[PDB]
Design a protein around this ligand. Structure first.
Ligand SMILES: [Ca+2]
Ligand SMILES: [Ca+2]
Length: 156
């Protein structure tokens, strides 16, 4: 019984796809093995530990019933991009929603303000040292690497 809830469709649909994929049997029930069948077919995660981690965190589990479907419903979320991928991206995402782990020079210092690091001529100065890219160059995974790896500061 819905109650005026738009919500995303791209993900909501994905779950149904993978769900009916293995549930095609039409048994009406779901086991702990079926939930992994999907990820095992496409190879989403490396080991069941991943899916089991999030799922287990949900609450509890058993042998087989039907509620197992939650695995997919949450999978679409747990699988989504988050701080888990990058630390810096986390601070940016807080302000710049468009943040996708990489942005130009404009958005770079734009979302940076969120991280509370104050990326000045210094930050960029070194960026061209390790990353080997000028200030007029968008940042990427490699960028966060040379940064997180650098490990510097001067505020305390
Ligand atoms: Ca089934
Ligand atoms: Ca962006």
């Amino acid at each position: 019984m819905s109650m005026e809830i738009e919500a995303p469709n791209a993900n909501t649909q994905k779950i149904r796809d993978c769900f009916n994929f293995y549930d095609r049997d039409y048994d009406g029930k779901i086991d702990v093995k079926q939930l992994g069948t999907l990820i095992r077919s496409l190879g989403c995660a490396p080991t069941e530990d991943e899916v089991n981690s999030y799922i287990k965190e949900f609450a509890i589990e058993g042998e087989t019933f039907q509620i197992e479907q939650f695995e997919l419903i949450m999978e679409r979320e747990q699988s989504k991009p988050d701080t888990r991928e990058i630390k810096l991206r986390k601070a940016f995402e807080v302000f710049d929603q468009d943040k996708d782990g990489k942005i130009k020079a404009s958005d770079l210092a734009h979302n940076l303000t969120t991280v509370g690091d104050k990326m000045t001529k210094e930050e960029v100065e070194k960026v061209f040292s390790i990353l080997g890219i000028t200030m007029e160059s968008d940042i990427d995974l490699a960028t966060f690497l040379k940064l997180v790896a650098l490990h510097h500061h001067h505020h305390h």
